[PDB]
Amino acid sequence: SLPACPEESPLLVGPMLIEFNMPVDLELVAKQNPNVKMGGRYAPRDCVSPHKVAIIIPFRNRQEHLKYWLYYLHPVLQRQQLDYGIYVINQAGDTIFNRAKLLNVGFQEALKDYDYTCFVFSDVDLIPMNDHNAYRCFSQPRHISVAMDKFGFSLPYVQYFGGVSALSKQQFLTINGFPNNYWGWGGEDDDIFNRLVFRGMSISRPNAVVGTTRHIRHSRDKKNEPNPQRFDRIAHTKETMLSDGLNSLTYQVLDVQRYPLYTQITVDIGTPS
Ligand SMILES: CC(=O)N[C@H]1[C@H](OC[C@H]2O[C@@H](O[C@H]3[C@H](O)[C@@H](O)[C@H](O)O[C@@H]3CO)[C@H](O)[C@@H](O)[C@H]2O)O[C@H](CO)[C@@H](O)[C@@H]1O
Ligand SMILES: O=c1ccn([C@@H]2O[C@H](COP(=O)(O)OP(=O)(O)O)[C@@H](O)[C@H]2O)c(=O)[nH]1
Ligand SMILES: [Mn+2]
């Protein structure tokens, strides 16, 4: 019998200063975040959060971005009073990148740790500027990174659903999760948007001030070149989503490391079939 947490956290400070030009030492971040437990798990000591959140980051060869991510998000996620865990889904090998398949791995593997009922899918290079931007689920699928600096602090188009988002366990299951066959850059977030609409849902978003988000500038990743089949794929989601996703997923976990501030799941997700 801890009480429920207040519906909105009283700890929040709003707008925050974010910068990416200093070094980050995860040992020190760990000491600055003493309440974050092994594998990057935290729940509040004083009340029970209804938000059981697994944060899923698709990842390969972005360790520097990830330290920033961890330095900025951990304090924010605790102020939001979430019962949360961080999962970095690391794609083994050096073949073409598959953001959405790694996201599916994250959903399925996090569920083996704990009864999570909310999933935040976050690119590793996106940091929220205002802690009023809730990193948890809503009654409709939630788009979080709504006002990114690299798109002029607004949406690049109104159906944009990339960057950072949150789906309840029921929402993600309803759309058969995410597509597995978007290899290389582009389109998979649009396909996911399509899925949600085809299943009767609409996108919920904070306002453009609360939703303000920074992207860490970086040059192009090798092995994630624009997918030329992306425009064709997103035109057929309605039919393809029925049998491409959670119900067609396999992968092989090579390694799970519990670090102080995150669990990292190293996974072989194959190449195109
Ligand atoms: C189907 C698809 O590709 N969806 C993308 C969507 O694509 C819109 C166009 O993006 C251009 O590339 C832009 C990119 O979107 C920006 O991030 C960046 O600042 O500049 C590049 C290059 O100018 C392509 O040139 C064009 O053909 C389309 O692909 O963009 C969104 C937002 O990036 C993405 O999440 C989604 O997957
Ligand atoms: O080699 C790669 C390619 C992409 N990603 C992950 O997938 C996301 C999407 O790619 P990208 O950086 O090109 O999109 P951007 O955020 O620049 O708009 C990244 O933020 C990372 O989380 C990664 O870790 N390594
Ligand atoms: Mn990026």
Q: What are 42's strand-pairing partners?
A: 84
221 lines ligand 2 (CB under 6 A): yes
Question: How many angstroms does the Cα of residue 98 sit away from the middle of ligand 1?
Answer: 16
Task: Give the pair of three-digit tokens for residue 71.
Answer: 């330095």
* 231 CA: nearest ligand 1 atom: 1
- Nearest alpha carbon to residue 136 among 121, 155, 124: 121
Question: How many angstroms does the Cα of residue 173 sit away from the middle of ligand 1?
Answer: 27
123 lines ligand 2 (CB under 6 A): yes
Q: What are 37's strand-pairing partners?
A: 41
- Nearest alpha carbon to residue 164 among 72, 258, 230: 72
Task: Give the pair of three-digit tokens for residue 179.
Answer: 């597509």
- The string over 94-124, giving b where at least 16 C-beta atoms fall within 10 Å of a residue's C-beta and e elsewhere, is eebbbbbbbbbbbbebbeeeeebbbbbbbbb
Distance CA 141, CA 30 (A): 31
Are the CB atoms for 45 and 9 separated by under 8 Å?
no
How far out from the chain centre does Cα 98 lie? Answer: 14
Distances (CA, A) of 217 to 43, 145, 181, 201: 32, 16, 27, 32
Are the CB atoms for 133 and 210 separated by under 8 Å?
yes
Is 124 annotated as contributing to ligand binding? yes
Task: Give the pair of three-digit tokens for residue 16.
Answer: 């925050």
Q: What are 85's strand-pairing partners?
A: 41, 54
Are the CB atoms for 2 and 47 separated by under 8 Å?
yes
Distance CA 117, CA 133 (A): 19
Distance CA 177, CA 169 (A): 10
Domains of the chain by start residue, with CATH: 1-273 (3.90.550.10)
Tally Cβ neighbours within 10 Å of residue 178.
27
Are the CB atoms for 245 and 70 separated by under 8 Å?
no
């998979």: which residue's tokens?
188
Task: Give the pair of three-digit tokens for residue 105.
Answer: 């791995």
Are the CB atoms for 144 and 163 separated by under 8 Å?
yes
CA angle 238-244-250, nearest 5°? 165
Structure's resolution in angstroms: 2.0
**Residues whose CB falls within 8 Å of the CB of residue 31, separated by 6 or more in sequence, listed in order:** none
Are the CB atoms for 176 and 142 separated by under 8 Å?
no
Distance CA 160, CA 142 (A): 12
Which ligand places an atom closest to the C-alpha of 100? Answer: 2
Is 69 annotated as contributing to ligand binding? no
* Atom 30 of ligand 1, residue of closest alpha carbon: 186
Is 46 annotated as contributing to ligand binding? no
- Nearest alpha carbon to residue 269 among 55, 56, 122, 60: 60
Task: Give the pair of three-digit tokens for residue 21.
Answer: 């030009």
How far out from the chain centre does Cα 235 lie? Answer: 24
Ligand 1 neighbours by CB, cut-off 6 Å: 150, 156, 162, 186-187, 189-190, 230-231, 234
Is 188 annotated as contributing to ligand binding? yes
Distance CA 26, CA 44 (A): 22
First to last CA, the chain: 51
125 lines ligand 2 (CB under 6 A): yes
Experimentally determined by: X-ray
> Identity (one letter) of the amino acid at 56?
I
Task: Write out the chain in H/E/C secondary structure.
Answer: CCCECCCCCCCCCCECCCCCCCCCCHHHHHHHCCCCECCCEECCCCCECCCEEEEEEEECCCHHHHHHHHHHHHHHHHHCCCEEEEEEEEECCCCCCCHHHHHHHHHHHHHHHCCCCEEEEECCCEEECECCCCCCCCCCCEECCCEEHHHCCECCCCCCCCCEEEEEHHHHHHCCCCCCCCCCECCHHHHHHHHHHHCCCCCECCCCCCCEEEECCCCCCCCCCECCCHHHHHCCHHHHCCCCCHHHCCCEEEEEEECCCCEEEEEECCCCC
